[PDB]
Design a protein around this nucleic acid. Structure first.
Ligand code: CTP
Ligand code: MG
Length: 431
RNA sequence: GGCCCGGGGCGGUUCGAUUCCGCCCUGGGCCACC
């Protein structure tokens, strides 16, 4: 360990050239903003020197009086953001902000209400400046520890808190370091975390609760780890146990033949198909929760129709989106048996038998049963039907897109699509 | 936009639904975009 972590610092700590570049960009931002005479404050990992090597992104916050309208914040904010960046892009889900570059560095110009007491927030990001003040004096000296933690989560796919990841936010990493004292202590204790572990940083306590909860020092009602999924919490805990057991530098390093994949699927004997549709032109933060719903809704449909679904997944390229499925049943019989009433109450038995049927119901164990016919005998046939009539329940945007067009890609043609990596992961193909 | 909790109308399926699949309207929270 001791040694491994030393080498690890070389992958997480920014070199003197990247730091300079960030400082050079910092000064430029101040000079441009001072010329406008705007009120701003630097926050985030850049401000606390906790940003991960190769992930430099400066956060500048524009402070506005709380009396201001949210519309005003949006208009003035974007006005200032655009006038201060070399080039910019504007694309958000709810809270507005401008993304750009200043002297080769990524920058986020974010508008927010300058308040006192983060109790009742007015804009989604009002806590941020307060997180900064709380951390400034506590994280000073332990920033390399935060970086190891970030580099660890990043190299293993659970670093972002955004929906595409559902992992650990940067701020959460910093609270953990403040709570445990170091990357190693965090990892040692995380091995004992549970799905009901509550970490109260301000109280310096860990208690049992109703769900994994990391209390914000700035607001006790805020769960800093709110969007961390159970499975990612589990992957982290399991990763911590492995790292302690066999301390490797590979834990900080970021981690196939389409013809091989065909052989594998052939050997598994499963039904592997995908629902393909055009990708809605919307933010990742809106797209993903929809693909998750769409993916889940179809998966549940496949389970109640007895196709015995194994797993589902999804891929979103720039063109299309794909919802992936694997089922144990490639084809089921046309008939099935519907349970009827007990022979005892004749009223319902009469109604049951009056039903026009093709085979005539029988008695088994004191109750009537009837052979009914399915409307589809293959997983693909059912999904084609489901997705055509229930598109409205597949997410607001993903559902409307599927309404205007979708297709079921199966067999040979499916391995030609940009989903091969996703399938391998989904099927547990190893090597 | 997604999730959670709660109201008020419906339709389909079923011998049988409040409870299965869905659809309108609506109240309150929460999360992602910093
Ligand atoms: N889900 C989020 C996202 C952001 N923030 C706040 O916004 C700040 C800036 O977050 P961001 O710029 O997204 O990342 P950093 O925290 O700066 O860390 P890094 O850029 O390395 O990801 C955080 O410090 C935190 O106070 C938060 O509380 N919760
Ligand atoms: Mg940043």
């Amino acid at each position: 360990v001791e040694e491994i972590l030393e080498k690890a610092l070389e992958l997480v700590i920014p070199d003197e050239e990247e730091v300079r570049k960030g400082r050079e960009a910092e000064e430029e931002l101040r000079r441009r903003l001072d010329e406008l005479g705007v009120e701003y404050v630097f926050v985030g990992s850049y401000a606390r020197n906790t940003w991960l090597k190769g992930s430099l992104e400066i956060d500048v916050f524009l402070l506005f009086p709380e009396e201001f309208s949210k519309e005003e914040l949006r208009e003035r904010g974007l006005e200032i953001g655009k006038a201060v960046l070399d080039s910019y892009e504007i694309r958000y889900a709810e809270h507005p902000y401008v993304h750009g570059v200043v002297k080769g560095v990524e920058v986020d110009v974010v508008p927010c209400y300058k308040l006192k007491e983060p109790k009742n927030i007015k804009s989604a990001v009002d806590r941020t400046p307060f997180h900064h003040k709380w951390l400034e004096g506590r994280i000073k000296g332990k920033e390399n520890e935060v970086r190891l933690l970030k580099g660890f989560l990043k190299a293993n796919g659970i670093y972002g808190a955004e929906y595409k990841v559902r992992g650990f936010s940067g701020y959460l990493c910093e609270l953990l370091i403040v709570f445990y004292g170091s990357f190693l202590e965090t990892v040692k204790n995380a091995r004992r975390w549970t799905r009901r572990t509550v970490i109260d940083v301000a109280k310096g306590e860990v208690r049992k609760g109703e769900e994994f909860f990391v209390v914000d020092p700035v607001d006790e009602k805020r769960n800093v780890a709110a969007n961390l999924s159970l499975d990612n919490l589990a992957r982290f805990v399991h990763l911590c146990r492995e790292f302690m057991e066999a301390p490797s530098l590979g834990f900080f390093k970021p981690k196939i033949e389409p013809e091989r994949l065909r052989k594998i699927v052939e050997e598994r004997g499963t039904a592997v198909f995908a629902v393909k549709f055009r990708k809605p032109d919307i933010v990742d933060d809106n797209l993903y929760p929809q693909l998750e719903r769409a993916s889940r809704k179809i998966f549940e449909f496949l389970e109640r129709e007895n196709f015995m679904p194994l797993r589902s997944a999804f891929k979103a390229s720039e063109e299309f989106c794909y919802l992936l499925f694997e089922c144990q049943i490639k084809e089921i019989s046309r008939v099935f048996r519907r349970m009827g009433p007990q022979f005892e109450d004749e009223r319902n038995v009469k109604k049951f038998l009056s039903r026009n049927r093709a085979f005539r119901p029988f008695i088994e164990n004191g109750r009537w049963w009837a052979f009914e016919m399915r409307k589809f005998t293959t997983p693909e046939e059912g999904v084609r039907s489901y997705a055509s009539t229930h598109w409205h329940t597949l997410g607001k945007n993903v559902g409307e897109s599927i309404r205007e067009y979708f297709e079921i890609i199966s067999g040979e043609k499916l391995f030609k699509e940009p989903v091969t990596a996703e399938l391998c992961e989904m099927m547990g193909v190893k090597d």
